[PDB]
């Protein structure tokens, strides 16, 4: 029913402005400095990062914006993926 | 949790004899006094009038015939600021000019008035004046607990100048008063390094050192040493702040001989003997030329006393029980003994022109016959 | 009324002695795995010493074959021989000539008689120096008749003839 | 405790130990060490000391004496024994709660002891290939590895029950980075799969699915 | 030319080392200088004290003296502890089993004497005596004479006028004298506290706007008697000083609002130091809470004597936010991992909220399964913005076990058992099992509860029992009985602290052969069954389902020996329609706390307990549920269960009534209490945490509501409540390694008729 639950959130915090800073052609170094460290990286396959801002305040939906930018062998960046919402509830 | 006494003891009272007949002419009080605190409140004397002092407040003015008052004014501020302002007087009560320029602990040197006891002026000084003031050409001087030989204009207290010295972390209340010698004063030091200065500008000309290493290696510099030295004919006898006797000149201030034995407590110069006591009640006699043990009486050993004084062919020393002990210059057994106070004796029995006096703990005076 | 064991056996259970084998991942094509951090790795080894309660743990002895201990001297052979007779033990052949000899079964006695063996010894004693040879290469050691001469066995009963001759000198 | 020169009393300690009674020999032995810090074989007494400590549950002091002997004179023809003994100390220290007799699984408690034990045995093995204590060391190694894997898997299970679906992925990645052979990993994989499923990250789920299908 | 270089019985070191020592071996001609250098070498061994060398051509005969050995450390001292003595010896390069001469006697003497100097007893005379042992060692006889230390004489403070000395040294710790009229203990000197006391003076002096003051100098003399000391300090006042605004700046991560609001400064008032420092620390705290756990904070004052006013200048910066990567625990011996991870409020893999981990720790503490709980937020190597919090914990054995067997006087066969574990096996949940078998009584008991049937916090736990109390003492106040029943619950939280719980219970009951009292019989007449008052062959039974409920609220500081926070409880229970005993009773409890010393060693404790009952229309509450107190935590002093109305009987088959002392027990209780937590200054503080003592002042009463006396004229109208029983005394609590322990002593003073005093009680519960 409706009893109680402490709020649940998962790391890699985000704003809605700095995500206008990062750009193509930048470095792993520049990006890592800009947005902090990617808490959830691609353990295998190609190197690729996953910045996910997911949050559950408990019994009131679940908010999550995620952005998992691509990369390149040389350690440079190629593409990004702006997922602001979670389709599917 | 309060039953933990343990210490070494002392010889109680060897062989009282009666080769003299000691009596107490008169004993006025000035009230406490000194209690048990350590100080130098020896009462001085002139013009057949003594001038005692106390711990906190009053002074007096007692005639030196039976101990009758001339004026007994307090000194602490009338309207008690915190509580009647215990002035904590701890300076040697000297006098000169018109004037018992008493020392203090509140960093004050009250220049009083022999006439009636009205402050000619107060004055603040760096640190406390644990020493005894000494007049020298209208220039008093004060050794402090901050090593500052701040001289002062006599009539006003106009601070002529100061000179800084050093001091270790832990010391004793060694507070050498200077001694005049052709403007060239001289003092000891809690450091252990006698200096030599000039008044008119406050400038030192020379430095020395006496004893071995101390500080976590505490040397026998602890001493009832009359940190105030003496000088004769251009040579000094600065019985060391330690006590390791040394003889030195004025200009160079160089070692003439080193009787490096113990820790001095006083000295007296007459002819050739140097009577004194060394750190353990050990009354000795030494010659001018060098460290020369004329003899050694050690009766009262470990039973602490006060610094001695000559008196018409009879050295005398105080005690911790109100006893007097009279001794011939020839070693050195007692020539008599009295028991004149109960509280005890702490300070130096000063004497002059026949009149021998001393302050008790509190019931100060005892005009000895 | 409980003895003869609990003393040369490791304490505890023996469940660990049967853990599952470490099969290896399993690794589909077109992909890598994050095995890239081998530091808890296990190096292979043939062995093969016994395990479990069968494994001896009895603390090692010394005065493993003769981690030698000597102390230079005058001569020793003319008296170390009778240093034997300090115990009056057997001989297979006395040899004053080579200044050494070899003996027959010698039976020590611990608190474990089955473990206590009658044993044969090659007494190695000469002054080779500047050197005083107190060592013996085990000759014949059997499990009270069952001939076994592996390391701990060969190490231990060596140490007996080791010291009981120093103790044979300290007279 | 009476007093003598060291020889006879040390032999007495020998007797009262070989019997089996510990604490008496313990006393005599630490004595012979103390009253003669550099006696006949003043380290022999140390080895016997640690052996008795172990056989008498004196775990912490055993540990301490082990360290002291090691750092006192590391190179020593028998030190491998001491390595192995330290390993036993850690291991037996781990599951010490005999309550497990009731039938519970210890595999979820503090693992730190297992970690020290594993480090020790590893150092022993790679430092001495053909010593007397290699095999049993290896067996214990394997078992400890499995234990650690199981522990981390427990944690991951708890989280995936909670919901924290980035903690799950991180923990599983860590295991898969460190214990990539035990049963625990081949068992936990579906957890990572489901996690990736949750956060609408699919291609990742397909990767882990190909993995899990390759077994 | 030499033939040998003998060595007379080294016996402590190998003679080969002596061969190495002598440079006079074959290879060089030996002469007087070589004799002397061999002398030097044998003196350079550190273990010998007398060498002579003799050479006759090739031959070389020598001698040697034997400083070894030493095994003795004697005392000696009276006050200080010889552990530090051994430490000095180690520093002195001396210990058991060495080669020592008789020279260092003065060295060790001076060492320990200056040690006592550091202690404060500047009069030290010990003695070192070396008696030998047969070629084995020599002894070190160390008897001590530590003369009395020195109490101070005065603490002067030159150069102050805004105050005096006394109130300054009031706020001191190194006192000078203690007055009996207010002696609060004892006194002694110590050099150490000088620094902290001086700085306390400094702070206090600052907090009144005397910003630019300073401690010019300080000295300490010593009586030329080593029995008294002195101390003086030199200072410079400086004027008052006035605040003028605040100048926060730097990188705020957009928080000025909260920031500016934290630096709310009254316009134009005097300076302070401590308030400024605290405000800075508070900025640090908040900014950490939002995530920047490692902020760059900096506060530099800016004064101006042109008006003696200060404008605070604070510049800060944040750093980086989110750091948590992996949370670990250490200390769980048998307790599971999850069991203590459930109580957490910082999800691994999220931004660090300092308050989150902190309240997690507090919750973990109030769980009360451990000695202590210790956090840590160490950084991670190489990463600039990550950490790994770890909680350090230490278990605490709580659950008991006992067992008692015997076949006593006539027919006892006691299978007295009992166990309750309270977090069984660290598995997470608590159980409890009792059971006994007297020759006539039979009783069982069993319960269990899993306080996580879900993960959100929904607990659950059942219980059932059995009682076969044959209950025939001889024939009076025996009241034979048999009862059994069960009950299940369901607990779930509602916020961070509060909670609720409900659940059904079912119980049967049966009883006969009881005495013709009036209470029993009034209740029976309420049930209607008009039993024969005369005799006592009475018989009756019942059965009834029941519904339960009870609120809670806990905020306690610790688990077992609290020091702060309260804990209210509540329990409600009411019959369900269809049963045969219609009524309801509710209770309550508040274990409030409060500390007074910030050390939290001095705590005021109050508590209470209440109740009620009824008969839910028509009927009246059944007596086998009434309330009554006494003997223990109910109320001390008195005997167990003696307060409250006393059962009166009817007319021993031959108002014709009689009074006695049977705590029949009423249906309305009210008991308060109050204590005073105090330390135990006479035991090792380490082992002292497990014991607890306090004074108290008990009170309280119970009574009967539906009691009547309109026709029961001359009897204590128990219906009146105002009949208070009181007591007061001393008790203590030991968390003994066997388990929880409590002993008590008091003396009930206001006690009405028949109150059975006991004055001395304990409990194994």
| Separation CA D28–CA D39 (nearest Å) | 14
Q: What is the gyration radius of the CA atoms in chain E, in angstroms?
A: 39
Shared-domain flag, residues B40 and B119:
yes
β E552-554/E584-590 pair status: unpaired
Interface of A with C in 9-68 (CB under 8 A): 43-45
| Separation CA E70–CA E76 (nearest Å) | 18
Q: Are B150 and B131 in contact (CB under 8 A)?
A: no
Output the CA torsion D121→D127→D130→D135 (10° steps).
10
First to last CA, chain A: 19
In Å, what is the CA distance from E30 to each residue of D35, E18, E20, E25, E581? Answer: 41, 17, 16, 9, 118
Q: Are E126 and E138 in contact (CB under 8 A)?
A: no
- E126 phi and psi, to 5 degrees? -110, 175
E575 beta partners: E546
Residue that the structure tokens 């009205």 belong to: B118
Percent of chain D as helix, strand, coil, to the nearest 5 = 75, 0, 25
Residue A39 contacts D where some CB pair is shorter than 8 Å: yes
Q: Domains, chain A, ranges and CATH?
A: 8-83 (3.30.1450)
**Cβ contacts of E341 on chain D, cutoff 8 Å:** 155, 158
Instruction: Specify the number of domains making up chain B.
Output: 2
Say if B and C touch: at least 3 Cβ pairs within 8 Å: no
Shared-domain flag, residues B22 and B138:
no
Give the dihedral sign, CA D92/D94/D100/D104. Answer: negative
3-state secondary structure of D100: helix
Buried b (16+ CB within 10 A) or exposed e, D165-183: bbbbbbbbbbbbbbbbbbb
In the A/E pair of chains, how many CB contacts fall below 8 A? 42
Q: Report yes or no on B329 lying in a domain.
A: yes
Contacts of B99 (CB under 8 A, 6+ apart): B111, B112, B113, B114, B120
Among candidate residues B164, B185, B201, the one where a domain is terminated: B164
β E390-395/E328-330 pair status: parallel
Torsion region of D89: left, alpha or beta (phi above 0 gives left; psi -120 to 50 gives alpha): alpha
Q: How many helices (H) and strands (E) does chain D have?
A: 10, 0
State the burial class of residue E404 (Cβ atoms within 10 Å of its Cβ: 0-12, 13-18, 19+): exposed
Single out the residue of E422, E427, E447, E327 nearest to residue E369, CA to CA: E422
Single out the residue of E434, E413, E430 nearest to residue E421, CA to CA: E430
D1-73 adopts what CATH topology? 1.25.40
Q: Other C-beta atoms within 10 Å of E514: how many?
A: 20
| Separation CA E191–CA E299 (nearest Å) | 33
B311 beta partners: none
**Cβ contacts of D77 on chain C, cutoff 8 Å:** 62, 64, 67
Method: cryo-EM
| Separation CA B253–CA E503 (nearest Å) | 102
Tell me the DSSP string of E676-744. EEE--TTS-HHHHTTEEEEEEEE--EEE-SS---SSSTTS--TT-------EEEEEEEEEETTEEEEEE
β B315-317/E214-219 pair status: unpaired
Helix crossing, D44-54 with D59-72: angle to 10°?
A: 150
| Separation CA E356–CA E345 (nearest Å) | 5
Give me C31's structure tokens. Answer: 């992909």
**Cβ contacts of C31 on chain A, cutoff 8 Å:** 44-45
| Separation CA B324–CA B309 (nearest Å) | 12
3-state secondary structure of C89: coil
Residue that the structure tokens 């609590």 belong to: E733
Single out the residue of B362, B363, B366 nearest to residue B55, CA to CA: B362
Q: What is the gyration radius of the CA atoms in chain B, in angstroms?
A: 20
Give me E176's structure tokens. Answer: 């000078």
Contacts of E267 (CB under 8 A, 6+ apart): none
3-state secondary structure of E219: strand
| Separation CA B114–CA B123 (nearest Å) | 18
| Separation CA D68–CA D46 (nearest Å) | 9
3-state secondary structure of D174: helix
| Separation CA E352–CA B281 (nearest Å) | 74
Single out the residue of A38, A71, A10 nearest to residue E385, CA to CA: A38
Tell me the DSSP string of E454-499. SSSS--BEEEEEEE-----SSSSS----EEEEEEEEEEEESSSSEE
| Separation CA A15–CA A31 (nearest Å) | 15
- E157 phi and psi, to 5 degrees? -135, 100
Chain center to CA of D26 = 24
- E176 phi and psi, to 5 degrees? -115, -45
Q: Other C-beta atoms within 10 Å of E726: how many?
A: 17
For this experimental structure, what is the resolution in angstroms? 3.8
Residue that the structure tokens 């395990």 belong to: C51
Q: What is the DSSP letter of E638?
A: B
3-state secondary structure of E52: strand
Q: Are B193 and B150 in contact (CB under 8 A)?
A: no
β E603-610/E673-678 pair status: antiparallel
Say yes or no for a CB contact (<8 Å) between A87 and D200: yes
Q: What is the gyration radius of the CA atoms in chain C, in angstroms?
A: 24
Whether the bond into C48 is cis, omega within 30 of 0: yes
State the burial class of residue E676 (Cβ atoms within 10 Å of its Cβ: 0-12, 13-18, 19+): middle
| Separation CA C27–CA C33 (nearest Å) | 7
Residue that the structure tokens 């001390």 belong to: E636
Give me E441's structure tokens. Answer: 């009584």
Say yes or no for a CB contact (<8 Å) between D166 and E338: no
Q: Are E677 and E653 in contact (CB under 8 A)?
A: no
Helices (H), E322-419: 338-341, 354-367
Shared-domain flag, residues B144 and B52:
yes
Single out the residue of D159, D168, D161, D150 nearest to residue D204, CA to CA: D168
- E746 phi and psi, to 5 degrees? -160, -170
D34, D97, D162: residue with CB nearest E455: D162
| Separation CA D205–CA D195 (nearest Å) | 8
Give me A20's structure tokens. Answer: 């206008």
In Å, what is the CA distance from E178 to each residue of B359, E18, E187, E228? Answer: 30, 66, 7, 16
Q: What is the DSSP letter of E152?
A: E
Output the CA torsion E254→E259→E260→E264 (10° steps).
170
| Separation CA E313–CA E265 (nearest Å) | 13
Whether the bond into B33 is cis, omega within 30 of 0: yes
Contacts of B281 (CB under 8 A, 6+ apart): B10, B298, B299, B300, B301, B302, B303, B304, B305
Q: What is the DSSP letter of C21?
A: P
Give the dihedral sign, CA E700/E702/E708/E714. Answer: negative
Contacts of E190 (CB under 8 A, 6+ apart): E120, E174
Strand ranges in E513-640 using DSSP code E only, listed in sequence order: 539-549, 552-554, 567-575, 584-590, 593-595, 603-610
3-state secondary structure of E556: coil
Strand ranges in E550-660 using DSSP code E only, listed in sequence order: 552-554, 567-575, 584-590, 593-595, 603-610
Give me E519's structure tokens. Answer: 């209470």
Contacting E with CB below 8 Å, chain A residues are 3-6, 8-13, 36-37, 39
Give me E265's structure tokens. Answer: 């400064």
Helix crossing, E274-289 with E354-367: angle to 10°?
A: 90
In Å, what is the CA distance from E237 to each residue of B286, E167, E207? Answer: 51, 16, 13
Residue D152 contacts C where some CB pair is shorter than 8 Å: no
Shared-domain flag, residues B116 and B20:
no
- E109 phi and psi, to 5 degrees? -55, -55
| Separation CA B60–CA B29 (nearest Å) | 10
Longest dimension (CA), chain B: 59
- CA distance to partner chain A, nearest, from residue D25 (Å): 57
* Class level of CATH domain C77-166: alpha beta
State the burial class of residue C145 (Cβ atoms within 10 Å of its Cβ: 0-12, 13-18, 19+): exposed
Say yes or no for a CB contact (<8 Å) between E425 and D104: yes
Give me E83's structure tokens. Answer: 């552990």
Q: What is the gyration radius of the CA atoms in chain D, in angstroms?
A: 24
For residue B140, the domain's CATH number is 2.40.128.630
Run of H or E including C143: strand C135-143
> Which three-class secondary structure string do you get for chain B?
CCCCCCCCCCCCCCCCCCCCCCCECCCCCCCCCCCCCCCCCCEEEECCEEECCCCCCCCCCEECCCCCECCCCCCCCCCCCCCCCCCCCCCCECCCCCCCCCCCCCCECCECCCCCCCCCECCECCCCCCCCCCCCCCEECCCCCCCECCEEECCCCCEEECCECCCCCECCCCCCCCCCCCCCCEECCCCCCCEEEECCCCEEEEECCCCCCCCCCCCCCCCCCCCCCEEECCEEECCCCCCCEEEEECCCCCCCCEECCCCECCCEEECCEEEEEECCCCEEEEECCCCCEEEEECCCCCCCCCCCECCCCCEEECCCCCEEEEECCCCCCEEEEEECCCCCCCCCCCEECCEECCECCCCCECCEC
Q: Report yes or no on B272 lying in a domain.
A: no
Give me C43's structure tokens. Answer: 């190096």
Give me E237's structure tokens. Answer: 């006042």
| Separation CA D145–CA C37 (nearest Å) | 15
| Separation CA E345–CA E615 (nearest Å) | 46
Single out the residue of E167, D87, D128, B277 nearest to residue B285, CA to CA: B277
Q: Are E322 and A9 in contact (CB under 8 A)?
A: no
Shared-domain flag, residues B83 and B137:
yes
In Å, what is the CA distance from E730 to each residue of A50, B139, D144, E637, E743? Answer: 64, 71, 54, 10, 9
Task: Supply the range of the domain harboring residue B334.
Answer: 1-30+293-369
A45, A56, A88: residue with CB nearest D200: A88
- CA distance to partner chain B, nearest, from residue E106 (Å): 13
Give me B159's structure tokens. Answer: 């601070």
**Cβ contacts of E149 on chain B, cutoff 8 Å:** none
In the B/E pair of chains, how many CB contacts fall below 8 A? 76
Contacts of E495 (CB under 8 A, 6+ apart): A4
| Separation CA B305–CA B302 (nearest Å) | 9
Q: Other C-beta atoms within 10 Å of D73: how many?
A: 10
Output the CA torsion E203→E208→E214→E218 (10° steps).
-60
Q: Domains, chain E, ranges and CATH?
A: 15-64 (3.10.20.310), 82-143 (3.10.20.310), 151-236 (3.10.20.310), 242-316 (3.10.20.310), 328-395 (3.10.20.310), 485-763 (2.40.160.50)
Shared-domain flag, residues B141 and B23:
no
Say yes or no for a CB contact (<8 Å) between E221 and B2: no
**Cβ contacts of D204 on chain A, cutoff 8 Å:** 42
Longest dimension (CA), chain A: 52
| Separation CA C115–CA E126 (nearest Å) | 58
Say yes or no for a CB contact (<8 Å) between E79 and B1: no
Q: Are E591 and E556 in contact (CB under 8 A)?
A: yes
Give me A3's structure tokens. Answer: 């009893």
Give me E496's structure tokens. Answer: 């961070």
């Amino acid at each position: 029913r409706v009893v109680y639950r402490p709020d649940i959130n998962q790391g890699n915090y985000l704003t809605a402005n700095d995500v206008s800073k990062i750009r193509v052609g930048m470095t792993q170094q520049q990006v890592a400095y800009a947005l902090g460290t990617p808490l959830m990286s691609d353990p295998f396959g190609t190197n690729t990062w996953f910045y996910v801002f997911r949050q559950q305040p408990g019994h009131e939906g679940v908010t999550q914006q995620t952005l998992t930018l691509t990369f390149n062998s040389s350690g440079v960046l190629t593409n990004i993926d702006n997922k602001p919402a979670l389709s599917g509830n | 949790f309060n039953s933990e006494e343990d210490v070494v003891k002392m010889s109680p009272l060897p062989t009282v004899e009666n080769q003299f007949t000691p009596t107490t002419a008169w004993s006025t009080s000035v009230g406490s006094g000194i209690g048990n605190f350590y100080s130098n409140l020896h009462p001085a004397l002139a013009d057949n009038v003594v001038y005692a002092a106390d711990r906190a407040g009053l002074v007096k003015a007692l005639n030196a015939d039976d101990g009758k008052e001339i004026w007994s004014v307090s000194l602490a501020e009338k309207d008690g600021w915190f509580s009647k302002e215990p002035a904590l007087l701890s300076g040697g009560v000297t006098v000169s000019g018109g004037h018992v320029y008493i020392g203090s602990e509140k960093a004050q040197v009250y220049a009083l008035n022999t006439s009636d006891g009205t402050v000619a002026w107060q004055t603040k000084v760096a640190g406390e004046a644990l020493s005894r003031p000494v007049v020298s050409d209208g220039l008093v001087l004060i050794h402090t607990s901050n090593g500052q030989l701040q001289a002062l204009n006599e009539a006003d207290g106009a601070v002529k100048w100061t000179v800084n010295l050093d001091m270790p972390s832990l010391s004793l209340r060694g507070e050498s008063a200077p001694t005049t010698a052709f403007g060239a004063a001289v003092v000891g030091g809690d450091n252990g390094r006698v200096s030599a200065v000039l008044m008119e500008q406050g400038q030192m000309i020379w430095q020395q050192r006496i004893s071995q290493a101390t500080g976590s290696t505490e040397i026998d510099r602890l001493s009832d040493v009359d940190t105030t030295p003496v000088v004769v004919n251009g040579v000094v006898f600065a019985l060391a702040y330690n006590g390791n006797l040394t003889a030195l000149d004025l200009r160079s201030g160089q070692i003439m001989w080193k009787r490096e034995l113990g820790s001095v407590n006083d000295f007296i110069v007459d002819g050739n003997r140097i009577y004194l006591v060394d750190q353990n009640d050990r009354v000795m006699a030494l010659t001018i030329d060098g460290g020369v043990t004329l003899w050694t009486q050690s009766d009262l050993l470990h039973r602490l006393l006060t610094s001695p004084v000559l008196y018409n062919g009879n050295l005398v020393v105080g005690d911790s029980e109100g006893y007097l002990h009279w001794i011939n210059v020839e070693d050195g057994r007692f020539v008599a003994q009295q028991k004149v106070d109960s509280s005890g004796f702490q300070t130096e029995p000063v004497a002059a022109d026949g009149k021998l006096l001393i302050q008790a703990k509190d019931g100060t005076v005892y005009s000895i016959t | 009324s409980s003895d003869s064991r609990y003393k040369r056996q490791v304490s505890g259970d023996e469940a660990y002695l049967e853990a599952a084998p470490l099969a290896e991942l399993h690794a589909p094509a077109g992909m890598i795995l994050p095995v890239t951090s081998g530091d808890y790795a296990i190096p292979v080894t043939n062995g093969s010493g016994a395990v479990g309660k069968a494994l001896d743990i009895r603390p090692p002895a010394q005065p493993g074959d003769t981690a030698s201990l000597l102390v230079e001297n005058n001569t020793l052979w003319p008296q170390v021989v009778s240093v034997l007779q300090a115990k009056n033990y057997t001989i297979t052949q006395r040899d004053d000539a080579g200044q050494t000899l070899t003996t027959d079964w010698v039976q020590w006695n611990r608190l474990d008689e089955d473990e206590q063996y009658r044993g044969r010894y090659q007494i190695s004693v000469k002054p080779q120096g500047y050197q005083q040879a107190v060592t013996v290469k085990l000759l014949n050691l059997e499990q009270a008749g069952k001939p076994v001469a592996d390391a701990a066995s060969m190490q231990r009963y060596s140490t007996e003839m080791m010291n009981v001759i120093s103790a044979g000198l300290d007279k | 405790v009476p007093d003598n020169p060291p020889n006879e009393i040390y032999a007495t300690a020998q007797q009262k130990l070989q019997d089996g009674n510990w604490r008496q020999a313990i006393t005599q032995l630490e004595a012979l060490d103390n009253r003669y810090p550099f006696g006949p074989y003043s380290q022999q007494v140390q080895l016997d000391l640690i052996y008795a400590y172990y056989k008498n549950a004196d775990l912490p002091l055993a540990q301490a004496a082990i360290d002291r002997f090691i750092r006192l004179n590391p190179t020593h023809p028998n030190i491998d024994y001491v390595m192995y003994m330290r390993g036993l100390t850690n291991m037996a220290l781990d599951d010490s709660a005999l309550q497990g007799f009731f039938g519970v699984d210890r595999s979820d408690r503090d693992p730190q002891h297992a970690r020290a034990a594993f480090s020790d045995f590893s150092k022993l093995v790679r430092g001495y290939p053909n010593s007397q204590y290699t095999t049993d060391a290896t067996k214990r190694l394997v078992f400890l590895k499995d234990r650690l894997a199981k522990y981390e898997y427990s944690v991951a299970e708890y989280y995936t029950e909670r919901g924290a679906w980035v903690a799950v992925v991180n923990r599983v990645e860590g295991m898969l980075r460190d214990y990539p052979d035990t049963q625990a990993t081949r068992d936990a994989l579906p957890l990572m799969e489901n996690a990736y499923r949750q956060m609408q990250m699919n291609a990742q789920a397909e990767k882990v699915a190909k993995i899990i299908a390759a077994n | 030319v030499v033939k040998d270089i003998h060595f007379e019985g080294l016996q402590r070191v190998a003679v080969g080392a002596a061969l190495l020592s002598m440079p006079v071996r074959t290879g060089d001609t030996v002469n007087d200088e070589d004799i002397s250098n061999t002398i030097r070498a044998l003196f350079a061994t550190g273990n010998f004290e007398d060498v002579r060398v003799l050479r006759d051509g090739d031959t070389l005969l020598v001698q040697v003296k034997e400083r070894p050995t030493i095994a003795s450390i004697t005392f000696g001292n009276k006050s200080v502890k010889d552990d530090m003595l051994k430490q000095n010896l180690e520093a002195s390069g001396v210990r058991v089993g060495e080669s020592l001469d008789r020279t260092t006697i003065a060295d060790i003497e001076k060492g320990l004497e200056d040690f006592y100097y550091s202690v404060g007893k500047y009069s030290a005379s010990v003695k070192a005596v070396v008696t030998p042992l047969p070629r084995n060692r020599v002894d070190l006889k160390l008897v001590f004479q530590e003369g009395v230390s020195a109490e101070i004489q005065q603490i002067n403070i030159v150069g102050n006028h805004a105050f005096t000395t006394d109130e300054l040294i009031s706020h001191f710790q190194l006192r000078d004298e203690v007055p009996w009229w207010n002696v609060v203990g004892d006194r002694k000197y110590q050099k150490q506290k000088l620094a902290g006391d001086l700085e306390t003076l400094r702070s206090y002096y600052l907090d009144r706007g005397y910003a630019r003051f300073n401690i010019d100098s300080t000295q300490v003399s010593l009586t030329p008697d080593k029995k008294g000391i002195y101390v003086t300090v030199n200072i410079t006042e400086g004027d008052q000083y006035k605040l003028s605004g605040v100048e926060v700046s730097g990188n705020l991560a957009g928080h000025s609002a909260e920031i500016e609001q934290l630096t709310k400064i009254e316009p134009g008032e005097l300076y302070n130091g401590t308030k400024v420092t605290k405000m800075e620390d508070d900025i640090k705290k908040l900014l950490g809470r939002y995530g920047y756990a490692y902020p760059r904070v900096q506060s530099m004052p800016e004064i101006n004597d042109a008006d003696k006013t200060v404008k605070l200048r604070v510049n800060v910066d944040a750093g980086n936010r989110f750091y948590v990567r992996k949370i670990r625990f250490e200390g769980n011996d048998t307790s599971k991992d999850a069991v203590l991870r459930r109580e957490m409020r910082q999800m691994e893999g999220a931004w660090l909220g300092s308050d989150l981990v902190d309240q997690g720790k507090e919750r973990l503490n109030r769980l009360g399964f451990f000695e202590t709980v210790d956090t840590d937020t160490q950084r991670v190597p190489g990463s600039p913005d990550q950490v790994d919090v770890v909680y350090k914990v230490k278990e605490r054995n709580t659950g008991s076990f006992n067992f008692g067997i015997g076949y006593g006087t006539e027919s006892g066969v006691s299978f007295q058992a009992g166990v309750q574990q309270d977090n069984w096996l660290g598995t997470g949940y608590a159980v409890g099992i009792n059971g006994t078998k007297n020759d006539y009584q039979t009783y069982a008991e069993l319960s269990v509860t899993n306080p996580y049937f879900t993960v959100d916090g929904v607990s659950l736990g059942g219980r059932l029992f059995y009682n076969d109390f044959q209950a025939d003492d001889a024939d009076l106040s025996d009241y034979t009985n048999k009862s059994y029943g069960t009950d299940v619950t369901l607990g779930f939280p509602i916020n961070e602290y509060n909670s609720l719980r409900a659940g059904l219970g079912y119980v049967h009951n049966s009883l006969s052969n009881m005495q013709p009292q009036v209470a029993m019989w009034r209740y029976l007449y309420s049930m209607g069954e008009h039993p024969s008052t005369s005799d006592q062959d009475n018989s009756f039974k019942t059965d009834d389902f029941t519904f339960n409920y009870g609120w809670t609220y806990n905020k306690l500081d610790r688990g077992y020996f609290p020091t702060d926070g309260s804990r209210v409880n509540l329990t409600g229970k009411v019959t369900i329609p269809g049963s045969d005993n219609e009524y309801y009773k509710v209770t309550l409890d508040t274990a409030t706390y409060v500390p007074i010393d910030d050390d939290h060693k001095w705590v005021v404790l109050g508590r209470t307990r209440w109740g009620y009952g009824d008969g839910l229309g028509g009927k009246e509450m059944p007596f086998y549920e009434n309330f009554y107190a006494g003997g223990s935590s109910t109320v001390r002093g008195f005997q167990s269960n003696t307060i409250g109305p006393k059962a009166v009987y009817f007319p021993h088959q031959a108002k014709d009534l009689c009074k006695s002392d049977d705590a029949v027990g009423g249906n309305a209780m009210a008991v308060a209490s109050l204590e005073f937590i105090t330390p135990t200054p006479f035991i090792s503080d380490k082992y002292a945490n497990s014991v607890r003592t306090s004074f108290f002042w008990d009170m309280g009463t119970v009574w009967d509501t539906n009691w009547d006396s309109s026709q029961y004229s001359g009897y204590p109208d128990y219906s009146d409540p105002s009949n208070i029983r009181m007591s007061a005394g001393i008790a203590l609590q030991w968390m003994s390694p066997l388990g929880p322990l409590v002993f008590s002593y008091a003396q009930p003073f206001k006690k009405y008729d028949g109150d059975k005093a006991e004055q001395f009680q304990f409990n194994c519960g």
